[PDB]
């Protein structure tokens, strides 16, 4: 059974700049005068789109800064000038034995200058009140790169284990990132507290960034 | 031109049946070489698994092959039955079309794919509630505990996708997911346009239509 090798795991280039990535077969994939390898592309939460078949044909209507080279074992995948829509996983597959299996995929990011977050606070609706659950969300809004913190206070406590995030892929329009952080109270403790703050700390930042509300208000 | 459409997705039981449907539109299924169905596990990579071809000669993956696939020329429709559902048969199942020069298992046509989860547990529909505003401002929904995935949210009835942020589902402790989308408008017109997230869950035929007005 054929196995195949992508390589990296992942990458990240500035846009514009070349991404070079390569698939290695347990075995030769070479029949007839052709090289049974393809590439696709598959962007977040889309079905793969092929790019490259028989090792270096073109897909029609792909667009020419995607080639495929190699023959045998070794293939090679390259974009000649990396565009912000070109975010997504890429993966290699051979098309000569059954199974037919694909590559394990490699994560292509673009990497843009740093972008502080815009933070955003809401606090609950009314109508959430009267379940007797109170959800806090944090906002954190078109940043890069990915990693940010945030930290949650209740009238100046800081909180621990009531919160949870949720991070976006990386937007094509703007080549950044967003968070999602939502902490959960219950309706007494809510209506028992007036400050709820959200500290964001980011590398785009000189100083943490704190948004408020007071409850009431 | 040519356009797959799956249906048969959704919740399934452990050790019941699954079958999947797909199709084809604005294209004769008996002018392709061969359909293939091709299956992605949540965060994992692609897996073929099985093809039928003009002919009516069949293949399967030996990883599963307690499955069958079929074609029927008159409904312009191909099918995958799997029965003895696991947990590992919990993916996104795409159909797809074989090719007919420069071999024939490289895909180009696909469909939209359809999320399968196998589980026991029993549906629950979501709570919608609002992420009032307080330059530019942001508001949003909380789409709040439902099972199983996936959850579709538009703003305005598709009309608004400019700046909107809809989040990656969180499992939370009760067993439910919940998820939120954003959307960043112009703060000159929270008070002429009117903003409404369009929530869809359809393993529970859950449609809400939630307006964010400024509180």
């Known amino acids: ?217 | 031109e040519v356009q797959l459409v799956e249906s048969g997705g959704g919740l399934v039981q452990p050790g019941g049946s699954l079958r999947l449907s797909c199709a084809v539109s604005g294209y004769s299924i008996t002018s392709g070489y061969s359909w293939n169905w091709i299956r992605q596990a949540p965060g994992k990579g692609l897996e073929w698994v099985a093809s039928i071809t003009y002919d009516g000669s069949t293949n399967y993956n030996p990883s599963v092959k307690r499955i069958t696939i079929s074609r029927d020329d008159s409904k312009n429709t191909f099918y995958l039955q799997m029965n003895s559902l696991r947990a590992e048969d919990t993916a996104v199942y795409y159909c797809a079309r074989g090719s007919h020069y420069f071999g024939h298992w490289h895909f180009a046509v696909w469909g939209q794919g359809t999320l399968v989860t196998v589980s026991s547990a029993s549906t629950k529909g979501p709570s919608v509630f609002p992420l009032a505003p307080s330059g530019t401002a942001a508001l949003g929904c909380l789409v709040k505990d439902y099972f199983p995935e996936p959850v579709t949210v538009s703003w305005n009835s598709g009309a608004l996708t400019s700046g909107v942020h809809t989040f990656p589902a969180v499992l939370q402790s009760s067993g439910l997911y919940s998820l939120s989308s954003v959307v960043t408008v112009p703060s000159s017109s929270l008070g002429t346009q009117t903003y409404i997230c369009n929530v869809n869950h359809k393993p529970s035929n859950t449609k809400v239509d939630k307006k964010v007005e400024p509180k």
């Not at chain 1, 100046?156 to 991070?167: D, H, I, L, R, Y």
Request: hydrophobic share 25%; with cysteine; aromatic share 10%.
């Open chain 1, 1 to 217: 059974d054929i196995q195949l090798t992508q390589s990296p795991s992942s990458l990240s280039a500035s846009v514009g700049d070349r991404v070079t990535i390569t698939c290695r077969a347990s075995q030769s994939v070479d029949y007839d005068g052709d090289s049974y390898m393809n590439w696709y592309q598959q962007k977040p939460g889309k079905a793969p789109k092929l790019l490259i078949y028989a090792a270096s044909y073109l897909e029609s209507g792909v667009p020419s800064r995607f080639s495929g080279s190699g023959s045998g074992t070794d293939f090679t995948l390259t974009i000649s000038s990396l565009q912000p829509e070109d975010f997504a996983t890429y993966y290699c597959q051979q098309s000569h034995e059954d199974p037919y299996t694909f590559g394990q995929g490699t994560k292509v990011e673009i990497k843009r200058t740093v972008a502080a977050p815009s933070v955003f606070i809401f606090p609950p609706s009314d109508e959430q009140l009267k379940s007797g659950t109170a959800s806090v969300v944090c906002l954190l809004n078109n940043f890069y790169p990915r990693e940010a913190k945030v930290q949650w206070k209740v009238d100046n406590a800081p909180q621990s284990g009531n919160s949870q995030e949720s991070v976006t892929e990386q937007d094509s329009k703007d080549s950044t990132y967003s968070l999602s952080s939502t902490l959960t109270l219950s309706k007494a403790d809510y209506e028992k507290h007036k400050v709820y703050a959200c500290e964001v700390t980011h590398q785009g930042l000189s100083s943490p960034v704190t948004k408020s509300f007071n409850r009431g208000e």
